[PDB]
Ligand binder design. Structure first.
Ligand SMILES: [K+]
Ligand SMILES: [K+]
Ligand SMILES: [K+]
Ligand SMILES: [K+]
Lengths: 413, 412
């Protein structure tokens, strides 16, 4: 009858900023860009010229080659990051607790690279040479499916697919599962491997991607000259745990998740609603969920994708929700450094929000060279800010009108 | 912790058994098969030869061609079925209630036909010929996305993608949204248009599909000679509503949703877990959620896909959970008639579970000709059964170890 408290007890990540959480976070707080020339595909025929890729990531350092060969990159990242998160949590998933340990990991795009290569085989060799592994490799739920198997996690089990809101919805949904007592632990987050021919083709065809060839200025959220997002890849996975459970086993606690809000624009298939009204409502739902006043928010990790419409409408939504306080709190987009990881965005950004609180550091928005009159909040430009944080809000305002907000709190007994 | 009661006030469906709920349901209770030769693709080079396709469905009867051209079939089905459910519910979505009306519709496969045609354009004509609408057309969340826009629904929204469990998870997740107080109305279920070249190739390559070329016997859940599933398409969408809200607007109530269980096998990417242990646990969680004794379950709408291992293991799971009662309750698989609608399966089967209670009729499992010693429960063979039902349980035991169970109850 009483809501369970839910704390963060482990973090795992692969990002363009590093192949673990520490490296990723350390790079973020020093304003290091993960954006560079596209190498994953031939960029000659695309308007987009840069991307945020994993660097020096060899999957075989983490599993047998034969296991990796039966996983699309998106699943590879999720299994690697999930194992990292569980090891960080020092959680021993035994037969006794397996039914109370679940997995809720989403992907926005799933195994598009596998679909592409398998479709080419279909065209040339026929349907009878399609791989027996094609379907399980391509479907987005196989990140959750493979993590479950790798971990022996037999509890509540799902996969949310909501475009850019994916990682944030997934964490909120997992939070709600534990809150109502249906699991003691959830391994949750987002994963994405969207650097593929069709993905670049598709996000260039609707001009969503920046065509800025200069990696030093391509991703520049809130900058007057921003012109679209820079696509990235990776996974961000956390371990959510019921508080008493965590305390009883001596878990380390990063902080507490206290609010989740989800709304829809009901407006347009790709264009965000005017003045960010849907995003404003999602922030408001999350604030009400956390039981706090808006003034208690110290820092907002913005969605901040560096498109014209997002950054402008998100600024407006923030002003609508926080009024005078909107100019008092700090806002930043770490996509200035990581690029937009799509379905994994909310996962990595949840991790940055959590570490911001734990370590008392706000990561900066880099690359703001020309201020935009319509984006006039404090975006923590250029340099990290050392500061004690009690509450941090993270937005994901995804294509398709999916608005998702999480609120994290410093852990106090 | 808020605990609202959640009732079903509207139903909408497209299935191989009919292009609305009334037709689908009436055919189901009359044991009509929706399975025939594949026409959507040329099956000559494919191992599988039959499928369960929509009959005489022309999307232009429901929207302008220009609107349909911007939707993959999976989205078309979702929008048509959702509008049918909202009209059935006689629900008027206004600015005033919009933020309290959400959408949670899943798809297991999303817009694979669009992805195939657009990628073939890429290969032959280059990336500049790829449509600006490609991404939003292909991604599974755009069923929820387009439904939201069509309805003006501004509340909690999401898309669950969990293979065969998709429709059942989606409805359960929407149930929990209303239960904790975060929406007054949810339009929820599953949609699927999986009859495509790569889908047929893929589910034949892993041997999941039946290669039985005879449509009269292809889908035969619990039969000794069952040899894989028959693929179908469509959407099953329902309107869930908080009880006091439903009463305030004079809504008609089909029944109540009371239990939801979700587990994972943690076993294998495609093979079901031994002895259905994961499915057993999911049903037990749903039963615990509803706060009832197993003996109170009157009818189970099985997942019953007609694969060897699903039907055997689901039968074993049912015995594990219900003990001696497993031989007292009724079980049936409506996939014997509809085929396996994949991500939409849980949606249509939720609808059949709800109508079973409301109408007091249990739909049969057709096509069982050879009993299987291992599948020896009461599968309501061949003919529908008139019966007063208080509780119905619906399973979806999806590929990849996703187990989902819903329990529905008769409303006052
Ligand atoms: K652009
Ligand atoms: K964020
Ligand atoms: K088979
Ligand atoms: K079922």
């Amino acid at each position: 009858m009483t809501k369970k408290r839910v704390v963060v007890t482990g973090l795992g990540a692969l990002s363009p900023l590093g192949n673990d959480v520490d490296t990723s976070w350390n790079n973020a707080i020093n304003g290091v860009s993960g954006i560079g020339p596209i190498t994953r595909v031939d960029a000659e025929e695309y308007p987009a010229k840069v991307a945020a890729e994993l660097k020096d990531f060899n999957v075989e350092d983490y599993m047998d080659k034969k296991e990796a060969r039966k996983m699309d990159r998106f699943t590879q990242y999720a299994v690697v990051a999930a194992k990292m998160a569980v090891e960080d949590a020092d959680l021993n998933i035994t037969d006794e607790i397996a039914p109370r340990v679940g997995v809720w990991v989403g992907s926005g795009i799933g195994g598009l690279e596998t679909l592409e290569s398998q479709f080419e085989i279909f065209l040339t060799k026929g349907p009878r040479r399609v791989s027996p592994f094609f379907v399980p490799m391509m479907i987005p739920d196989m990140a959750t499916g493979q993590i479950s198997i790798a971990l022996g996690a037999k509890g509540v089990n799902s996969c949310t697919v909501t475009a850019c809101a994916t990682g944030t919805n997934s964490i909120g949904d997992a939070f709600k599962v534990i809150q109502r007592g249906d699991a003691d632990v959830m391994v949750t987050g987002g994963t994405e491997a969207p650097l593929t021919r069709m993905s670049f083709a598709g996000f260039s065809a609707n001009k969503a991607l920046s065509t800025n060839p200069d990696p030093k200025t391509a991703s520049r959220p809130f900058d007057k000259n921003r012109d679209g997002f820079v696509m990235g890849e990776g996974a961000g996975i956390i371990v959510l745990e019921e508080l008493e459970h965590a305390l009883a086993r001596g878990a380390k606690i990063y902080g507490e998740i206290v609010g989740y809000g989800s709304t829809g624009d009901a407006y347009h298939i790709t264009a965000p609603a005017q003045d960010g009204e849907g995003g404003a409502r999602a922030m408001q739902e999350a604030i009400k969920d956390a039981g706090i006043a808006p003034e208690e928010i110290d820092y907002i990790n913005a969605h901040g994708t560096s498109t014209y419409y997002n950054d402008k409408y998100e600024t407006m939504a923030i002003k609508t929700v926080f009024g005078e306080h909107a100019h008092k709190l700090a806002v930043s987009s770490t996509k200035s450094m990581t690029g937009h990881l799509l379905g994994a965005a909310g996962g990595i950004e949840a991790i940055f929000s959590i570490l911001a609180i734990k370590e008392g550091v706000i990561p900066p928005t880099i690359n703001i060279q020309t201020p935009d009159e319509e984006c006039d909040l404090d975006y923590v430009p250029d340099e990290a800010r050392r500061q004690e944080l009690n509450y941090v809000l993270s937005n994901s305002l995804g294509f398709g009108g999916h608005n998702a907000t999480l609120i994290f709190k410093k852990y106090q007994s």
